[PDB]
Amino acid sequence: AADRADILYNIRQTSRPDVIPTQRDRPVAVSVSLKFINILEVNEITNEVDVVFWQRTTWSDRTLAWDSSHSPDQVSVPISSLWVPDLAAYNAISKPEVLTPQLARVVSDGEVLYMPSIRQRFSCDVSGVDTESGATCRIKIGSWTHHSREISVDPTTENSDDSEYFSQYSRFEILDVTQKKNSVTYSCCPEAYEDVEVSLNFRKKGRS
Amino acid sequence: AADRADILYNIRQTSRPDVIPTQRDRPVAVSVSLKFINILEVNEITNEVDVVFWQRTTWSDRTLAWDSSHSPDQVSVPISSLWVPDLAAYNAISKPEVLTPQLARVVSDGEVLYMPSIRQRFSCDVSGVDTESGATCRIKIGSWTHHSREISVDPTTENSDDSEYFSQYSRFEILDVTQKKNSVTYSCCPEAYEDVEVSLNFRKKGRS
Amino acid sequence: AADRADILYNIRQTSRPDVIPTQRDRPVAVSVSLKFINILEVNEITNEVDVVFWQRTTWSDRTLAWDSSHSPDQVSVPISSLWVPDLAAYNAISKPEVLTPQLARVVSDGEVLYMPSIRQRFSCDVSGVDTESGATCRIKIGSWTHHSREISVDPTTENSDDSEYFSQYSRFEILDVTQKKNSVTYSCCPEAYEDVEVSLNFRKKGRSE
Amino acid sequence: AADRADILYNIRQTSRPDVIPTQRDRPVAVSVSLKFINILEVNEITNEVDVVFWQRTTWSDRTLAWDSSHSPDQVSVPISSLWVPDLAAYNAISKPEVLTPQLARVVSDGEVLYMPSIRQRFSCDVSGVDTESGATCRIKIGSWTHHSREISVDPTTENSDDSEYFSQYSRFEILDVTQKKNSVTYSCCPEAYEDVEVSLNFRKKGRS
Amino acid sequence: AADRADILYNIRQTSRPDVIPTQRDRPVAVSVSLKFINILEVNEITNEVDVVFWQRTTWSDRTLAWDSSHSPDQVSVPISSLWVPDLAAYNAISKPEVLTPQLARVVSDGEVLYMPSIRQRFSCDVSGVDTESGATCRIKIGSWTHHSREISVDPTTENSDDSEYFSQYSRFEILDVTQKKNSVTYSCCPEAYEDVEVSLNFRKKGRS
Ligand SMILES: N#C/N=C1\SCCN1Cc1ccc(Cl)nc1
Ligand SMILES: N#C/N=C1\SCCN1Cc1ccc(Cl)nc1
Ligand SMILES: N#C/N=C1\SCCN1Cc1ccc(Cl)nc1
């Protein structure tokens, strides 16, 4: 006998947008997977690439779960009412442009899902973009302030073609995508920051 | 009898901008109709266009109804005070730029109307743009987080000149526009999201 | 005797920035006139132009009035503290960049004056810009959501210098400016929306014989 | 004997940012002085300059005064918690861009000092910019809505080096900067609006 | 004992973001160090550069400390909840483009750390950029409204590779980075303003 309104209110009433949902005291496991949608502006001279991708972000806050037996099992919730991982693109050279409604999806089991479409410039290896082997641009995305003990990242290795959602009208094509997990520490501080290194192998389509 | 100040006050009193106005347990009937007003920047090599259209969006929210017997049966309300469908252009390469005041129109029966002027850039086939056959750019629009069970999108099929309000000073011209109802799915979830496929057909206005 | 501090306070109470001050059942009369200040990037190929102009907007909101007997009859108030017409440029291709402070002038008789300096890009006939007759760019401005029964727009046309405030350093010169009242009923709905057509006639300077 | 916290706490308890601090009924003596920091862009053909400057602005608001005989007599406050003069550049062709933190300095005696660094484009005389005598670009800054009786603008004309803080790396050089006062009346209304006409005599750098 | 929610809750219970936390009556010690990431745009004619760096900002705020005996001694906190130094690059010709989540790291002892990746444009010496000895662009950063007796800025001599995080895909390379502590007094007031001067010696790459 619970409607979507009741569900939302319960989330607001128990969620803390500025507090990380640390269960017991292990880190919060965040899953991050990108699905390239397009590759626009490209410069082999400056090694800069403009790209659009759907950043599928998933985690969980069990303090928000309800009984979906006779109630909706999911609801969209403004991300501002929810705690969202402070993910950041380490080699980005421009703020991310969120092209889609900043709405998240909360599941009755406490699972939270946020998958916005983002356009952002990157500084990566662009050389070879016009060769057969193409170029390989690596994008590192992970928490900015939360280290491993508090946040952990892992690619969603679920099956899905590299360019499953890639634009056909794009001047380029995706050869292969490989989302690996990686760590990043600094000469100052001990704790390491987990990230996902996404390698996008793409090249310029040549007319026959 | 109550006036505008009362109605508006009451609307703001009962509007839940973050909760989908699901009457009973059926999707919200959102009708979408794009009205191309101009076609600016256009590139055939990168398949990219900059368009200005009026996104006529329509839906109902019974919770906002009231007796208009002896009072205004229509008022302008800030879309921030209302729940608004979370639409997105699945093939947009730039966030939508609302060029007009973000005001919606509310009718006593609960029929909400919002139609803003939006300039945006999409990724689409532009080939032939400089021919008599012209180019056909297809733009899909639908909810981003709400599937068919939560939201339905049907093109407000209004038989009208596809260029009824299209600038005459544009370097291009419309041959014909068609808006079909549609949907998409992904490799993660069974739920399908309804959209609208506005197929634009235009070519550069030859200089004769 | 009340001061400006009070006048403002009392105004923030009776003011409803989201409620159009209709008089009984009389549409709100809003006067709109542009005072062109400059003409920048003029692309005769895309029929696009960047214009800077002061938009003098007037209207009355009795619910704002007060006793100017022993108090100032005029004060400057933030536009968010009161209702403001949802004017728009129907043929604008860029958002209206407001260059000046967004404050309006309020008179104890409820008369409201708002005159912002705006930088904006429109789509219009730019052809002929480099000819003796020049080009004639028409800008259509009106309420976006309030139709004729709610908002009535009329240009405060009066024998004035069309280029009175136009920049002398501009690459262009104003041949003539005319503001006409118009109306548009969309083939969807009955209500007719009022607007003002400002036809700007201008050309490049330093032309040949 | 109060402290920073008290001084601020009290400011918001008395400050009215929307109310001009008119003592009795004499206008607010606001002083404006520009300190040109750079000249980034200049168009000889279209008569437009893009410049950077520090806008030293001073006025008084005794309703914010406090006894600093046993506490600081100066504190930095966000201009958002204070009333501020509604100055504008009558010949500005782009909205002002404040590069520095929007903070003012309030002295225990009610004196207020706000000096932001600004990047802005103006329409002015560029002719002669490439000659030994240089060009003269006048910039008129005054209140946008408060006529002479409410606001008065007077430049603090003293002995200061015109290009004292001017960047040595700019492509131009300051020849002289005279800051005169002026009154601007309108063919609409009787009262005039006091303004300050800053004359920036500069030329392009080009020695032997 | 307490959770992260308790920590933050209390932080916002005693934090005065608009008040400088001057321990006793002495200036706040703000440590500032730049960690260069990239050198994008460069114009030797206009003497302007586009730089991306991590501004490692550090200071202490005793009004936020708490017991971490059986609780965490660190949390990520939105900077909107803390007081933050009003730092500003003097020769910056564009406002800072914060590319990362605006979160600060606070320790149980009141230590605060904020390291935002920033993309910004400066007016400095670009001459020789294309020579072997490269160019030396000096960047000056310090408080904007707080003088030496309120805020003191000093570069953490944390020796390390100057191009430790510098992108290897940049068109340029770092030859040397030196960060000296300096001071500046303006012909307005006797109070001096501390700042750090970061000299970045770089050049365009190439092949031997
Ligand atoms: N996979 C998947 N789902 C996708 S890809 C592009 C849009 N969607 C639908 C969606 C699903 C969930 C959320 Cl939080 N946001 C968007
Ligand atoms: N069709 C239609 N209506 C149009 S086209 C240009 C202006 N209008 C009026 C209008 C009517 C309703 C709303 Cl929510 N927004 C705008
Ligand atoms: N005419 C006129 N008035 C002008 S033109 C440029 C500045 N002014 C003063 C003014 C007066 C009132 C308002 Cl709301 N805005 C500006």
Ligand SMILES: N#C/N=C1\SCCN1Cc1ccc(Cl)nc1
């Ligand atoms: N003169 C002076 N003061 C200057 S020039 C550049 C920075 N400063 C310090 C300052 C002092 C006070 C305020 Cl409100 N703003 C800036």
Ligand SMILES: N#C/N=C1\SCCN1Cc1ccc(Cl)nc1
């Ligand atoms: N040194 C260091 N730390 C770095 S360099 C790039 C990211 N980090 C982690 C970090 C740590 C703390 C804060 Cl407030 N912000 C960022």
